[model samples]
Target: MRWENLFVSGVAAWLPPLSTAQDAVMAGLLDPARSKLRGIESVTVASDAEEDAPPRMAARAARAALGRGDVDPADVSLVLHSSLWFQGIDLWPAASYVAHEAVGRHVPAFGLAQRCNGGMGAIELAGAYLGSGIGAGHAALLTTGDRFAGPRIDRWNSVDVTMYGDGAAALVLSTRDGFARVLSTATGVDNSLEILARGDEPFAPHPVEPSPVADLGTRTVRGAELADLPDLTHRYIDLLVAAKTQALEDAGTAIEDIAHAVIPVSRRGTGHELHDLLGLPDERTSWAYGRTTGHVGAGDQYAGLAHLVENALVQPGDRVLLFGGGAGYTCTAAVVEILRM
Candidate 1:
């Protein structure tokens, strides 16, 4: 439940203009060649469409975090990397490759994947490992992905592309000495929607001829149903509320005791949803998804933490909540108490 040191040093992103939901929408509308406009005037792209590869952004962010922390890569004892977008290669471990090239190749490295819930999941895992006696003297590296670019048109139709953006974030968790202690964590899943965002098998057969752009043929999937919006929203809200409640109960803190709430804002408009659902004011909540880095998939909350620390939004002894919701109807939440320097 406690860490000798859990500090976030650096945060970086590789965002293209389309990374912003609003900008992406404008791009789709203004570009007559795009062919997907229905005269809605504006559109928002997903956080995943901003860049080409997740690892590229991850490496950049890792370097920045390391530089800011002034920690040597050789000092890292564990690397925990996750990504939703991979090159579809079987023989490669992207995390290891990233560690080798980024900031911790000399350290032992492992990879994890939890789609959208990956950010908090990785944080919880690192916190547990470091809090346990096993890794008392070691440091852990946590990272996650950003690539959503694909050749198929249908692939882009899903909110995952236009609403998603590419980027990476790294957190340095150490036991040597620092701020914050992990209190509790939880995860939830909705299996009924499993088929909603599945990708083709890597070796699946495909037609040799490319499809035409007619009918937005580039995307492999269509936008989510507006009818499902309420259900999705409720599911996420219920899970987040439950998780935060449980974590706070375990930490002996109340909702009002939380000094800062860092939750994933998939789109700029999501702030209204959070206000409605959690009833948290905009000032107490962090909104890094819009102007800062846009939605960097699993990197959103992690990047938000870095921003909070850099801007001094978090102070010693302040309670912080991390909330994340991903595409597979997955959600994760955690509570931490800052220890400060």
Candidate 2:
């Protein structure tokens, strides 16, 4: 969708202390081969003693964004929290908690889960909400938080693809002028690949009951075996490219015009693979910063954008591309243009 007047006013991230890959290997948390191949130097880890829940982390980031933007909480029309893993309580309103702690208002608030692409997904939906009947001068806060530590799942080995981290990222979007203007956003999905995450495993009464722990690698292998899909990797690449193409077209921008692109946070090799698929050089992407942070679930895009802005990597007239992909076989792309310093 093409947005005419939407802007990004602020961005921030809340991350705990880092646990180096060297320490993780020495402590037996991860294997040496995996660490070397992944090339993730360190990942933010939340200490068990603090017990800082996802909502609180998100709220902390939200507060920073609001402060950075100089935006009053009263101007925020919505609070949308997105995530991929469990949020402390079994059945509760995590979004409300974030709103209460940061927004400090009773404005409409809700949660979303589109897996790792959730932060981008939230921006798309929030833009729609701001443009729909709310008129001008309104803003929205988008947040994502996740803590991958657990006994039910091993953050290091549960997923053979990428390592997980605990952190939150936030962005403030508004109709009012700001540092950057969001030109457009687009999404695409191939539902057939949905089984890749579930595989042939039957639904259980509780989480991780089928196996002793969460096994994403096994699920992926089993799904490919059961589905027998042809050229699954190519299919995923095609869908991702289509969404990005549409977003750029809607924004009236070309790939060459984008100063930077934010792809999913992944292992070093996987980051290279994504750069190839996007036809962008390594210097044009956020993989350097992502390698240090690991995969912070749904907040990679948001955190990446913040990194660019905070470091002045982008200047007025430069365009940026934000890409997102989640396990449910979904992808999203957004185009933003730097309007001011």
Candidate 3:
């Protein structure tokens, strides 16, 4: 949908120190050949301390964005936090904790779980909330944090698609004024593709019981075996292209008009496929920076945006396409035009 007054006032990404792919290879966590093929040089390795927890990381990012925008906490009417893995605690109100730490306000805060697209998904949800006049404040906060650690995950090899990273990102959206204008956002979904992640894995009944390491590669393989459809990649591409087309059309722009594209930090091949599909040159996308951070869950788009602004790759009047997809066969695309430096 086209947005009349929505704007991105501030954006920030907080990441921990990176652990290089070479180090993972030496530790027998990753194959040398695979690392070379993925093109991801390093991935963030968050500290194990309590202060470096997911919620705290998100709060740190939120604080940075709020500070950069010089936004009063009282103006933030809602807070939405997203994560891909466990948030250091079970069944806890992590979103409220983030609000308490960052905003210091009693706003309506909620945790969102849309898999890898939760961060961008929160934008769609928050935009609707702020645009509908439900919130008195003109701004909303969106944050995402995740640490892809072991026991439950083998960050390097658990997924054959992409490597995982640890980091957090936050964005402040307002109806008042900002450096960038949010033109429009669009989403597309296909329920039949949901089984790509689930495949045939049985549901866990207990929360406390520990399970073996997740086999996402196996799961995806099994899903493909059981799927009664054509190639999964082709199906995803169809939906993704539709979402991108819709977003650009709604924003009154075209692929040729976009200055940069913020895409998910997937493996090299996957990233290239998306770039080719969108008809964007490699330099126009944030792949140069993305390879260094690996896949940061739902924060890839936001992190990529921060990278573009920090590097001055975008200028006034330049429009950027923020595209994202998640495991639930969902695709989200947003168009933002730079209004100022």
Candidate 2, residue 77: lDDT: 88
Ranking by lDDT: 3, 2, 1
* Candidate 3 local distance difference test against the native: 0.89
Give the 10-residue window scoring lowest on summed lDDT in candidate 1.
35-44
lDDT of 1: 0.59
The model with the greater TM-score, 1 or 2, is: 2
Model 1 error, position 50 (Å): 15
Whole-model lDDT, model 2? 0.87
TM-score between candidate 2 and the true structure: 0.95
Q: Which stretches of candidate 1 lie above 4 Å from their native place?
A: 1-53, 70-72, 87-90, 103-106, 131-137, 150-157, 160-162, 198-237, 267-272, 288-292
Better of 1 and 2 by lDDT: 2
- Stretches of candidate 2 off by over 4 Å are 134-137, 208-211, 268-272
Worst window of 10 by summed lDDT in candidate 2: 265-274
TM-score of each: 0.72, 0.95, 0.97
Tens digit of lDDT per residue, candidate 2, span 1-341? 89889999999999988878899899997899998887788878886644578888999999999998889898888999999888888799899889888887567889998988899888888988987876343899999998876676687778877878889999999987778999999997888888899888898777654447778889988998998988987778888988899999999998888899998877545444778778889789998888788888899999999899889999899999999998888899999999888
The residue-by-residue lDDT of candidate 3 on 1-341, one tens digit each, is 99999999999999999889999999888999999888889988898888889999999999999998888999999999988888999978999999999998579999998888888888899998987888789899999998877688888888887889998999999999999999999997776777878878878777535757887778877888898777677788789888899999999998999999998888545435678888888888888898899889789999999989888889999999999888887888999999888
| Candidate 3 lowest-lDDT run of ten | 265-274
